[PDB]
Amino acid sequence: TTQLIQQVSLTDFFRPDIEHAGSIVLILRHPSDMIGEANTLTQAGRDPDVLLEGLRNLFNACTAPWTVGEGGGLRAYVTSLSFIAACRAEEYTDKQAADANRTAIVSAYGCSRMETRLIRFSECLRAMVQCHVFPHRFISFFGSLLEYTIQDNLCNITAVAKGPQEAARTDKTSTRRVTANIPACVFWDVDKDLHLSADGLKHVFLVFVYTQRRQREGVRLHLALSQLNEQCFGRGIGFLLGRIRAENAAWGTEGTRALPLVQLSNDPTSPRCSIGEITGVNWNLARQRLYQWTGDFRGLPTQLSCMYAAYTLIGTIPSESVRYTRRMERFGGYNVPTIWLEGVVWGGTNTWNECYY
Amino acid sequence: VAYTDRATLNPWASQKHSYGDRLYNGTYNYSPCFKFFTPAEVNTNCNTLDRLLMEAKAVPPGSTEMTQDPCGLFQ
Amino acid sequence: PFEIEVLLPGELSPAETSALQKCEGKIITFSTLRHRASLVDIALSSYYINGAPPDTLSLLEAYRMRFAAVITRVIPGKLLAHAIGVGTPTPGLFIQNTSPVDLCNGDYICLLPPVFGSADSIRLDSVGLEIVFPLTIPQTLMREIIAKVVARAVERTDVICYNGRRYELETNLQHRDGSDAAIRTLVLNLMFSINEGCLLLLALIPTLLVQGAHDGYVNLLIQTANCVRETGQLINIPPMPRIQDGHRRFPIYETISSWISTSSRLGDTLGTRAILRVCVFDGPSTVHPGDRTAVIQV
Amino acid sequence: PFEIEVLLPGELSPAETSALQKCEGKIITFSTLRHRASLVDIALSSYYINGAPPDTLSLLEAYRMRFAAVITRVIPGKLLAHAIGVGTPTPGLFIQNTSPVDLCNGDYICLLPPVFGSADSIRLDSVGLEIVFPLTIPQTLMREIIAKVVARAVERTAAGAQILPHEVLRGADVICYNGRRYELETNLQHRDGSDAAIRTLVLNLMFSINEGCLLLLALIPTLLVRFPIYETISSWISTSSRLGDTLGTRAILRVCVFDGPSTVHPGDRTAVIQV
Amino acid sequence: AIASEALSLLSNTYVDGTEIDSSLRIRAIQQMARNLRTVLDSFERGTA
């Protein structure tokens, strides 16, 4: 009834040893595509190679740094949700839960070359949202972790693709069943902000809030759980994010007379330009003036410079009146508040809807 | 081919770019006369006609273009 | 296979029960999905926005917000129905054609309120409510209708030919709290389709109509359009500026790329999205009004 | 499970029936679904419209209205296939890569007509028909492909329309994926498909955008510091909605690889899951 | 309701025979009986 996906990768961003069974795991595209997209989509005036500076130092502080460029299949493919949650923990509203998860992921990992890795990833995302290379097209989604095998610094993991959560058999734990586990920092249900009844079926989304200013950019990651419709979620999110939308509309771009067309077309006795001269023999004295309009529009907010969020459907919960449970348990050698979701069917294609308003 | 005494019957609808071919050719972008002035289809029509002829000589094939389509392979 | 149950009120008249049994493959809607439900949500009374029967444009928004379901076999006591929106496996799904227009194989189905003559619907006097069933047309019919109602909307603040037959639309627009929202979402898309790149495409109008002549394709396209065929002989369009960073940037890329996302979004936000695909096995190519066709979940 | 059989023709020459076996994990498309079918529906002959060969618009449109199916195996006198339609639980579904760009795990599959280069396909001269296979790439690349090829075509008309070309540029357009540069269309000459199939494509796309950011400039004159005026609005909305519906993005499959190599190169086959 | 692990323990069809399951199956069927004995009486109680 369910399907599985296997993949081997480097363990510098993901550790299937400490991560609990049932957590979310994401994958990354090849970093070589970032520069090919940045040098062509960077806003006019901005420096396009600050991303390259921010990116090179990331792998300089990562094992096997001489293995970038060929993509033979031995790169850091997958990553964990808690990793990004800890990298951007200074931006979530739940101060204590954020910093607790941060120190926990620092201690449980190598804890020697981990803090440097985190700050490199932090400004890496900061430079990612500096040239309109938004990190919602480079971060895909995998199902919850089910089984793993590791020998040293290289792991083979398998996760569910789509279907019921407790329809698999992990077959090495105490029980043969697992449930979805998430850090309490990313969880954010919108219906209890929008003040509507929470009964019935609810969808799951991931959002990527963007802040665009001068030398100050921010990117969070929220796992929203709402009963709102497939497309109506966009109109719902704008009501809560109305501030950042207006901030971006004014601080997004930092790098002329009208014409009365309908007026002079409603009235006659205007200079006409019949097709007889556009045939193409002397098409300069025919169009000598005909108007001037002195018109040009270069610097204006595009629909891409005012974007502030991008969501995507992941799964639903058919059981009405969900009863998600939040509690603190040990994660390595530290306790972190995790929320436990039961009976969630994965599915849905990876299509991102961008909320630019 | 049939009348070995003249090329065509009207020089306005049989040339490479005659008036009729320019009006309708199917290759220049319902009409019943489309199945005549269109090389892309008359080629395969006459080709399957030839295949029928060769099968008749060797004496299916197709069992069609005789029924449901007379004068289709005959032009 | 997820099915929802619809509670039939007791003491129902046999005439109403017979009329209800005739509604076998019609589409209904739900505000909140659940296994057990009542009949007050299917009634038109649940559509009320402020205190009254809803408007058309209000129904356009109620169709997006609410979940959808399809009716299946009805027993004298219960009314079973299956859901379509959420991802669920459902074998052998047939729907009943409710529009006056014919459908054929390979047609996407949309959802819109009845804009033709007074919609037929089951009436329940003893219960005191009246349920109305939505109308289903193909996609192309949906876009042409939507464009006309909004055009009439901005006019306040209609014939349609198809298969050689003309139809008249009666647009109900007595409300106002919904008509202004359609104008807001319309200009918002027009405003975001303006980049630094228009000036290039705007500077091609002279050569455009030259290609309109002596080529034989752009003629009616110039005819059906009005703004471009009037601007081409009335404005000068100052020649050209330069690019800020032109050594590594391509400026006509964003305007041709960003526009794609708007056009795809425009057809959905203005009205309803595609919900189903009709594909019948061992059946006729074209279905007539009142008949049932086996359809696929989109 | 539903499966379609494509009746192989008789008297097939050995070189022709052999090359049909070379394309095993290739997808075909069926107008109507049936257990038995001929070959004309698979050939391009059934695909052209108004007599003339189909264009990209007709290609993109027909890909939506027409249904898809995948070939599984070939028999010297029999050819079967499996459908991606209603609910068929096709087991062990594998497909072959027809695009020059590699694929990886967790990538979604969507279809496109061949735009980059000449369409490689089988041609049966003995019977007189040929079978063209659609190109498949991930979703995250599709929107960028269409935007670039139209931008390449409009920049060509601009150079030809303008008395003086504005040649000064950045070099050559290159798409990158998995650290591999494709580098499409080196030369300026060899206008193979410049205006051959995408001719009418750039026409509809440039006019809607022209009508788009002109209608706003002609309705509110305050943005920058006899006449219907409504029929133009209804026409623009109807067109922009239809054009957006045609140029849509809908995933059809998902590459799910188990105990196999993650990255696949053009020509390799891989197992996929029905989305 | 029935637990998925119990369903998997019951649908084995004699592919076992160790000692860490002779008690698991017994407790599963005991839970089954204890649940059914109340689901049955639910109707007798709901009549009134």
Automatic annotation (TrEMBL), chain A:
<dbReference type="GO" id="GO:0019069">
    <property type="term" value="P:viral capsid assembly"/>
</dbReference>
<keyword id="KW-0167">Capsid protein</keyword>
<keyword id="KW-1048">Host nucleus</keyword>
<keyword id="KW-0946">Virion</keyword>
<dbReference type="GO" id="GO:0003677">
    <property type="term" value="F:DNA binding"/>
</dbReference>
<protein>
    <submittedName>
        <fullName>Capsid protein</fullName>
    </submittedName>
</protein>
<dbReference type="GO" id="GO:0019028">
    <property type="term" value="C:viral capsid"/>
</dbReference>
TrEMBL record, chain C:
<keyword id="KW-0167">Capsid protein</keyword>
<dbReference type="InterPro" id="IPR002690">
    <property type="entry name" value="Herpes_capsid_2"/>
</dbReference>
<dbReference type="GO" id="GO:0005198">
    <property type="term" value="F:structural molecule activity"/>
</dbReference>
<keyword id="KW-1048">Host nucleus</keyword>
<dbReference type="GO" id="GO:0019028">
    <property type="term" value="C:viral capsid"/>
</dbReference>
<dbReference type="Pfam" id="PF01802">
    <property type="entry name" value="Herpes_V23"/>
</dbReference>
<protein>
    <submittedName>
        <fullName>Capsid protein</fullName>
    </submittedName>
</protein>
<keyword id="KW-0946">Virion</keyword>
From TrEMBL, chain E:
<protein>
    <submittedName>
        <fullName>Major capsid protein</fullName>
    </submittedName>
</protein>
